[PDB]
């Protein structure tokens, strides 16, 4: 069957800001098979921005 | 059968902000098969932004 | 059968903000097969943003 | 059979804010097969944002 | 049979805020097959935001 | 048979806030097959937000 | 069947800003099979920009 | 079947700014099979630019 | 079947700025099979430019 | 089937600025099989330019 | 006061399978402030696995 | 006062399977502030697995 | 006071399989402030795996 | 006070497989402020793997 | 006070396979402020692997 | 106070395979402010590998 | 206070394979402010490799 | 206070293979402000390699 | 305070193969402000190599 | 305070093969402000090599 769409906007303004399809902020920390005499830290940061 | 849609907006303004399809903030911490004499910390941060 | 829709909004403004399809903030902490003489901590943070 | 819908809003404003399809904040803590002489803590935080 | 709906709102404003389809805040804590001489704690927090 | 609905609201304002389809805050604590000489605690918190 | 679309916007202005198809900020830290007498830290930062 | 589209915008202005198809900011830090008597840090930064 | 598109914009102005198909900012730091008595740091920066 | 496109823009002005197909800013730092009694640092910078 | 525990198992085998700290399968369906001339269904499924 | 426990099991085998700390299967269905001319259904299923 | 634990297992084998700290499978379906002349369905599935 | 732990396992074999700290499979479907004359479906699947 | 741990395993073999700190599989589908005369579907799949 | 750990394993073999700190597979599909007379689908797949 | 660790493994073999700190597979599909008379699909695949 | 670590492995062999600090496979597809009478597809693949 | 580490491995062999600090495989496809009467596809592949 | 490290390996052999600090394989395809009556494809391949 037929499909009809009449789109009549006047001055449509559309914003897509600070968006992501997929975002991952991970960390694998620790000995990982080695010999460490210190602290292992990891701070991955992800920021989509302000305004 | 037929399908009809009449769309008549006047000045429609649409905002999509600070949005994600999928967001993951994970961490795997600890010995992980190694020999550590210290602290292992991990602070993954994810922020979608203010306004 | 036929399907008809008449959409007549005047100045419709729509906001989608600070939203996620799926959000996960997890952590796997501990010995994980290793030999640790310290504390293992993990603080994954996820924030959708203020306003 | 036919289906008809007449939508006549005037200035409809709609907000979707701070919403998630699915949100999970979990943690698996403890020895996990390893030998630890310290505390293992984990504080995953998830925040949808204020206003 | 036919189905008809006449929708005539004037200035309808609708808010969906701080809502989730499914929310889970869990934790699996303890020895988990390992040998620990310390405390294992876990405080997963989930917050939908104030206003 | 036919079904008719006439919807005539004037300035309808609707709020859905701090709501979840399903919410779970659980914890599995204890030895879990391991050997622990300390306390295992777990305090999963879920908060839908104030106002 | 036929498909028809009439698009009649007047002065439509559309913005896509600060967006990513996929974003990852990860880190693998620790002994990694080596012998370290110091701290190993890693702070990968990703920022989508302000406004 | 036939497909028809009539596009009639008048002065459409479109902006794509500060966007990436895929962005990765990672780091692999630690002994990596070597013998280090110092700290190994790594701070990969990625910035999409302000406005 | 036939496909027809009538494109009638008047003064369309389009901007693509500060965008990348794929961006990677990584670093592999540490002993890497050698003998170091100092700190190894690495700060790869990638910037898409302001405005 | 036939495909037809009528493109009628009047004064279309298009800008592509500060864009890259693929951008990589990496660094491999550390002993790398050698004997160093100093710090090895590396700061690769990539900048797409302001405006 | 003193606390003593003598644990002498011989070949203890322990299984933790198909378990979750917290599981939620929810759905928010319906108009949600919009104008729909069709059915909205949602069937979120969660399965812990067979054996 | 002193507390003593002598645990002498021989070949203790323990199974924890198909268990959850907290399980929720909910659904919020209906108009939810919108105008629908169709059925809204929702069938969230949760299954802990067979054997 | 003193705390003593003697752990003497012989060939202890421990399995943790198909387990999650927190699992959420949610969906928000419906008009969501838009004008749809079709069905919106959503079937998020989560599976912990068989054996 | 003093804390002592004697761990004497002989051939302990421990498996952690198909496990996640936090898992989320969500979907936000529907008009989302737009004008659609078709079905919008979404089937996010998450699988922890068989055996 | 002093803390002592004697770890004496003989041939301990430990496996961590198919595990994630945090996993998210989400999708935001629908009009998203645009005018579509077709179906929008999205099937994000995440698989931790078999054995 | 002093902390002592005696680690005496003989032939310990440890495997970490097919694991991620954080994994996200998302998709944002639909009109996104544009005028489409076709189907928009998106199937992001993530696989941790078999064995 | 003093901290002492005696690590005495004999032939320890450790494998880290097919692992990522953070993995993201996303896609943003649809009109994106343009006028399309065709299908827009996107299938980003990420694979950690078999064995 | 003093910190001491005695590492005495005999023939330790360690493998790190097919691993990434951060991996992203994304795609932004669609009109992107242009006028297309064809299909736009994009299949970014990332593979960590078999064995 | 003093820090001491005695590293005594005999024939340690360490492999780092097929690894990346950060990997990105992205694509931006579509009209991009132009007028196309054909299909635009893009298949960026990244492979870390087999064995 | 003093820091001391005694490294005594005998015949240590270390391999770093097929590794990159940062790898990017991207593509920007489409009209890009031009008028094309053909297909624009792009297949950037990056391979780290087999063994």
């Amino acid at each position: 069957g037929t499909h009809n769409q009449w789109n009549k906007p006047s001055k449509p303004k559309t914003n897509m800001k600070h968006m992501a399809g997929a975002a991952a902020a991970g960390a694998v920390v620790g000995g990982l098979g080695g010999y460490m005499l210190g602290s292992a830290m990891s701070r991955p940061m992800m920021h989509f921005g302000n305004d």
Side-chain angles (χ1 to χ4, degrees), chain A:
Chain A
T2 186
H3 292 264
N4 306 316
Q5 205 183 20
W6 292 264
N7 308 296
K8 291 177 70 68
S10 53
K11 303 184 177 183
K13 64 179 73 175
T14 300
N15 296 5
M16 283 73 74
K17 296 170 69 179
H18 313 275
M19 61 80 71
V28 177
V29 192
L32 277 296
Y35 304 73
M36 185 180 288
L37 188 153
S39 59
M41 71 290 291
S42 180
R43 183 177 292 171
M45 294 177 71
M46 186 176 289
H47 200 314
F48 284 23
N50 313 319
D51 188 12

